[PDB]
């Protein structure tokens, strides 16, 4: 306790070695205040520390970051940290409330005049103060709203200076010309709106033009890059090389995503005030997606969540013209390694939801593009199976609408493509059976061991590998399977069941797309009236391959009468019935010419899975 008192008296009588000692003492008090943050003696320390801080803060701004300048910067950092780190809750024994007007006014002035590495902390401190100390500081929200409006108004001029008109040895610019504070502002503004309610109705009208102008803001270099790319017929993505300060571009994009999140938050009930601004949302969104730097993946994730929240409000109809543009994988993802390795499912799921909701009014080219993209996605080698399940479900849902195209040839071709993709996926699943079985057994044994995991060579664990471990035999682990706790067999069975469920619906939809008059049905059994007709010589191959590959994926369920439930279970039997029922809805000639060919392969397959 004596050390604190001597440091306090030295600080009081103050008004390299001395400044270093003062820095050490003040920041050590910051660290050790946990023993004194809460207590009945807080008012004395508060009233004795506010005057010294206020008096010191009246000095001119210091921009250099070396020597005594750095010393005093650290002093201010670990002094003003006390305001934020203190227990400023709204409990009855709060003692800062009666002595807050002068200090909050001084902090607002500091925000007005301080620099980045000070104004950011000052605005955060003001936000936390207003969050709890709004009881009697309610009358000064006018100054804060005026200041934030001034910042949003001067955003345009700072952007112009930084783009159009454009470490110790550096000079720190004024905080008014920094994008960090602008990007941090929206969260503070939202929190302030949450706290109070007496200054929300009229101020939103003034805010709306500012956010509109900010969102419409653009860089001339990137604009001309996009224009020339369009002139060439291509699309330009990434960062324009003309930008001399890449960090400035990244900060601008961060501010843009923050503003978009703020707009999405405000659209909840105040949408009537932003009605005129809707048509520019999609073009701007695609522009931000193209212009986002690859490194900043968090910005892309924020954009995706914000766009999902925007979509949920039933404003999807405006996105139709850009549906084709968004499909291009380059536009949606980019070249980011982290994005491509982690966030693809989120973006593709939101895009799939958007497409499904507005599926009614799609032109044929859009249908073709979505079919191609998602059939390609179904073949992805993602470690799990949720992504594949979502892709398959979307394709199965879109199959119903694909039958409504004006031209029957296109619909038939697209349905056949879907079936071929499913058959290829079945073959891929077939190829991985031994590896799945081995991994399941190894996982069971490892879970039985119940010992902490270590990443090093071990003679007790010989490194066994096979064909399926071609690119999965390296020490690094992007995501440990232990967290997933996934069994390959169960996931494969899940996907197989989903595909089997969807196949019948797809075939039923195909059953109602025949070209009238293509074939003659003068005399035929009534059992073969509504079945699909008119298969060429290249579709019977697809059907035969589908049957042959599907019938072999039942090994995952590992005399025959089985009167009681034995060997094969109810699930397997009903799945077999469902699979067999599909081939009751085709031309009898196709049935004969397919099974007369596939019977011997089936007879060979039965020996390995007797339940067939």
């Amino acid at each position: 306790m004596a050390t604190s008192l001597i440091e306090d008296v030295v600080k009081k009588l103050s008004v390299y070695t001395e400044l270093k000692v003062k820095a050490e003492a003040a920041c050590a008090l910051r660290d050790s205040l946990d023993h004194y943050t809460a207590g009945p003696a807080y008012p004395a320390f508060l009233k004795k520390v506010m005057p010294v801080f206020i008096h010191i803060l009246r000095q001119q701004p210091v921009f250099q970051t070396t020597g005594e300048q750095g010393h005093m910067q650290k002093l201010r950092n670990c002094i003003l940290e006390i305001l934020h780190r203190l227990p400023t809750s709204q409990t009855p024994p709060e003692h800062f409330e009666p002595y807050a007007h002068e200090i909050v006014d001084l902090l607002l002035e500091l925000v007005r005049t301080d620099n980045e590495d000070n104004v950011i902390l000052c605005v955060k401190i003001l936000s936390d103060i207003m969050r709890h100390q709004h009881k009697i500081m309610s009358g000064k929200v006018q100054t804060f709203l005026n200041l934030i409006q001034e910042l949003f108004e001067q955003l345009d001029k700072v952007v112009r200076d930084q783009l159009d008109n454009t470490q110790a040895n550096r000079l720190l610019p004024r905080g008014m010309y920094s994008f960090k504070v602008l990007a941090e502002c929206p969260i503070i503004v939202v929190s302030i709106f949450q706290v109070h309610r007496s200054a929300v109705t009229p101020n939103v009208k003034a805010f709306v033009p500012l956010i509109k102008s900010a969102l419409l803001c653009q860089a001339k270099a990137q604009d001309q890059a996009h224009r020339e790319a369009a002139a060439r017929g291509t699309i330009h993505i990434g960062v324009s090389p003309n930008i001399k300060n890449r960090a400035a571009f990244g900060d601008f994009i961060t501010a843009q995503v923050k503003t978009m999140s703020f707009l999405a938050y405000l659209l909840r009930q105040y949408s009537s005030q932003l009605s005129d601004f809707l048509p520019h949302l999609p073009d701007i969104i695609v522009r931000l997606l193209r212009d986002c730097p690859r490194d900043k993946s968090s910005a892309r994730k924020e954009l995706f969540v914000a766009i999902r929240h925007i979509i949920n409000f039933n404003f999807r109809k405006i996105f139709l013209p850009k549906i084709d543009e968004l499909l291009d994988e380059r536009t949606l993802v980019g070249d980011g390694l982290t994005v491509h390795e982690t966030m693809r499912p989120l973006a593709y799921s939101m895009l799939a939801d958007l497409i499904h909701h507005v599926r009614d009014q799609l032109s044929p080219e859009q249908i073709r593009k979505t079919v191609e993209v998602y059939t390609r996605n179904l073949q992805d080698n993602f470690p799990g199976t949720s992504f594949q399940t979502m892709s398959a479900k979307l394709l199965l849902n879109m199959a119903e609408c694909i039958a409504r195209l004006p031209n029957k040839v296109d619909a038939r071709h697209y349905l056949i493509m879907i079936l071929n993709a499913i058959a290829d996926k079945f073959a891929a699943m077939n190829r991985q059976y031994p590896n799945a079985v081995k991994l399941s057994k190894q996982y069971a044994q490892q879970a039985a061991k119940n010992v902490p995991e270590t990443y090093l060579a071990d003679k007790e664990n010989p490194p066994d590998w096979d064909e399926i471990d071609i690119f999965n035999a390296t020490p690094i682990k992007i995501s440990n399977p232990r967290d997933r706790a996934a069994d390959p067999v169960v996931d494969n069975k899940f996907l197989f069941r989903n595909l089997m469920t969807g196949l019948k619906n797809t075939f039923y939809q195909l059953k109602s797309c025949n070209i009238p008059g293509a074939v003659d049905l003068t005399g035929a059994p009534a059992h073969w009236t509504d079945v699909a007709y008119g298969f060429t010589a290249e579709e019977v191959k697809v059907i035969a391959k589908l049957f042959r590959e599907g019938a072999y994926v039942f090994r995952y369920y590992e005399y025959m009468a089985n009167f009681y439930m034995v060997s094969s279970s109810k699930e397997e039997k009903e799945l077999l019935e469902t699979f067999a029922t599909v081939f009751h809805c085709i031309d009898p000639a196709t049935f004969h010419e397919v099974f007369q060919q596939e019977i011997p392969r089936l007879y060979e397959m039965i020996h390995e899975h007797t339940a067939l």
Partner: protein
Amino acid sequence: KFIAIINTINMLDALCQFPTANSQSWLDNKEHIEWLKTVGKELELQQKKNSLTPNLRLPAHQASEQLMNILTKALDRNPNDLDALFSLVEGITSDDFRETPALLSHIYNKIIRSDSIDFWRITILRCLDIYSGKTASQRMKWYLLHNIVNPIIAMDVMRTWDDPNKASRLLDRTVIDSINTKIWKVNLPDPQEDLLQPRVDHTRMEVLQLSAMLVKYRHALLQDARKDFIKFAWTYIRLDDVINKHAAYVVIGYFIAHYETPAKIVSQIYFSLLKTNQNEGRALVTQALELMAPVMPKRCPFPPGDRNPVWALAPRRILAEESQNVQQMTAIFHYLVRHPDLFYDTRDKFAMLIIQCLRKVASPPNPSNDNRKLALNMMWLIWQWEQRRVESKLSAEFQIPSVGRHKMIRYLVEFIAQLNERYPLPSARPNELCKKATALLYNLLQPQYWGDLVEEMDLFPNVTDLVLAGEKSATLLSADPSDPEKCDDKLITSIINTLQVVRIVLHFKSDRWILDNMPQIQKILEKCLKSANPEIQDCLHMADRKYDGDRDVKPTIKRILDAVPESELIAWLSGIATESMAAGNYVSGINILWSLGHRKPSIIDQHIPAIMRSLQSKLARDHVSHYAALGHQ
């Protein structure tokens, strides 16, 4: 022309369908192969656009696969002709053909599994030379080249896994020197400027993976390139990409574990890792810490008798600095739990912080499963610390202040009351967290352990009242078990958990306390003793070794009865049993009478008639009726 091309491809594919005929010699001509590739590229380009006539889509789609299969078959002959393989790889990676499993199924079974130490070194050197600058190969080609480089090394490691210090003749000195010169020794003046091309991150990640594998499995071969490897790893840390940075951290951790480094580098890397806050690459940081921290004492020895290591204070420093961020707290707690032995010594500055942050970690209203697991894990950590201290004393040490112990105990009681799982019981209709929490609670309250706190500890009146005496809970307990609507599973689970809690706490109480507080025990247990639900009765009366996990905690009723001197409790129980049997709720009456008789037989004499009437009227009658019905069936 497309129809002619399709027909020609189909005929050529039909040919060579029976390779056991010596008729495949026609595939060796190179002009034929080049012309085939030209026509295939043209046809694939036409397919890419919707340019083909609507009647010729599927045949061309299949002709593409046929052509790729024919090309793979041609390549199969003369595997050593790596020029054809490289040309095909460049074509595949340049968006000219469509990939097929045949290429990989040939690479495997011809190159990766080749039974010769030769033909591996040549391939490795050629692949590195293609990678080693030289341009003329886009980034995708470099990645697909590493695809073939790595498996050969993996297979070589596999084939030489034996006791007699097997050497890697494949990994000769020349190959290692080439790797050094081409990857490690090469210091990029400004690799950032090269970032203006796509897919470079994948190549960088692949080389990092190769380096990590080679270190981890052949640490005995880098004594002549330790310095170059360290410079490489430190240089690659500067990458702005998250995954690459964390991979570099993993590599440096591997080297630290498998080699000796100045303590400054270890401390700097560890401090930088701790400050990490991004949610991306969490598993990479976990692996790096698991590789680094255990060998920290060897890398950072401390003076004898000194219990303030710098690396010990650093976690405390970050805990203080970034206490505003919950994610940092979760990360540091996850790191801390895994290694209790190391921090047993420095628990002095950690125990109070853990107790204080217990509430923050898991929200009493509605926490997440991971938060619950983390809270239970840190509780078990402090329990392990206490057990370690006791065992060391057996085989003025710091002890937690009574306030902290009280806070931990009350929070644990609330948490177990609120738990999601249900305690197993013999009567359950047709759990790890509950078992672990109850076991910890029992262990802590042992006499030599904190059990001395029981005397001054009340019966948690707030929790017990709000969970048992609740009017909604009271009516649900008095409600019919048959009706699902009044069968709220969560309330039943909470009641069971609190009943087990009170059982455990009473198992340690003092007879004087029970006698004095008899009114409170009666008040709390009156509602439950009347319950007509088998699970509640089993909780109150039954006590089995199997369900307690080897814990000798006698039932509540038996304990309270044994507390009675050889009273009011007996009369109250007799009245409850009489009213229950009269009302027709045999479940409670039978259990109460069983316990009473086990205590003192003298009271069953006046009850005999009700038992006999019930047995002759309902129970035996229905049992015999059911078995007669089964015989009839």
